[PDB]
């Protein structure tokens, strides 16, 4: 029993973390085979950060402009190029700790584990979700650039996020491992807004199933709704509309618990309409939207 925010084991990602220095900036790099990935803004001076021209900035640099350290072992940079908002630094040594991996673009609603690093060194791990507005509500400090987000499928590490920056509202923006930002964001030190965020309905319901599997049952009722009537109420409280596809995903959980998806939706409607009245679901008064149906199944 018990239900916790759970990150994947981070060992395989730890042996990929290195330190990357250009000028007076030190941040984190991801070392896979003979390539080191890091945010490209590592080449910027304070004044550059304001209105950078990255192509211009990168041609004015060389292989010796970059210092890469794995532990205290110095890695020799023998090549460099731009990969959208990331630099690909080619090194003369292949990472012997390279796991089976792939690069994935994570979808809004989906989750991943963040390995927050400072000075090339793993500092902490936590579970995170890609918001519908394409930001992440992370916990990051200066120097955390290059920290990555990942999932594990069997043996394979799927890298999906690399950290770049924090927006004025305190939320975070970054890229996939091809250097394309999630969302409307650009790597410039200028005020940027995200779109209005919505609640990941599919995850909320998944977390409701997790509560039932774990003995919390107070919020259940015999009321029932149609998908359409649920969505009518959902959007009014800033929830994502739920689709038949989403209903089909909750199938296995619905079967394990004996609770129809539409019945759980009616439970959610009442919670939305009437609140909780001091009571808690899995020790929380906030309706949790950062566990996917998969995260629930995997943990339960």
């Amino acid at each position: 029993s018990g239900f916790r925010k759970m990150a994947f084991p981070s060992g395989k990602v730890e042996g990929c973390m290195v330190q990357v220095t250009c000028g007076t900036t030190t941040l984190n790099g991801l070392w896979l085979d003979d390539t080191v990935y890091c945010p490209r803004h590592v080449i910027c001076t304070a004044e550059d950060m304001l209105n950078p021209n990255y192509e211009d900035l990168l041609i004015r640099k060389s292989n010796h402009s970059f210092l890469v350290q794995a532990g205290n072992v110095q890695l020799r940079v023998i090549g460099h190029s731009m990969q959208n908002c990331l630099l690909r630094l080619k090194v003369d040594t292949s990472n012997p700790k390279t796991p089976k991996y792939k690069f994935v673009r994570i979808q809004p609603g989906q989750t991943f584990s963040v390995l927050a690093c400072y000075n090339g060194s793993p500092s902490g791990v936590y579970q995170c979700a890609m918001r519908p507005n394409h930001t992440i509500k992370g916990s990051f400090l200066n120097g955390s650039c290059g920290s990555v987000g990942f999932n594990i499928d069997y043996d394979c590490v799927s890298f999906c996020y690399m950290h770049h920056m924090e927006l004025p509202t305190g939320v975070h923006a970054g890229t996939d491992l091809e250097g394309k930002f999630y969302g409307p964001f650009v790597d410039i030190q200028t005020a940027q807004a995200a779109g209005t965020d919505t609640t990941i309905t599919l995850n909320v319901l998944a977390w409701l199933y997790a509560a039932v599997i774990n003995g919390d049952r107070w919020f259940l009722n015999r009321f029932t709704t149609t998908l359409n009537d649920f969505n009518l109420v959902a959007m009014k409280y800033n929830y994502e509309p739920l689709t038949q596809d989403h209903v089909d995903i909750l199938g296995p959980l619905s079967a394990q618990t004996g609770i129809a998806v539409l019945d759980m939706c009616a439970a959610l409607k009442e919670l939305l309409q009437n609140g909780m009245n001091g009571r808690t679901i899995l020790g929380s008064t906030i309706l949790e939207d950062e566990f996917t149906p998969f995260d629930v199944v995997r943990q339960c």
């Binding site: 941040l27 945010p39 803004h41 120097g143 650039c145 410039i188």
Partner: peptide, 4 residues
Amino acid sequence: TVAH
């Protein structure tokens, strides 16, 4: 906007 702060670069980390």
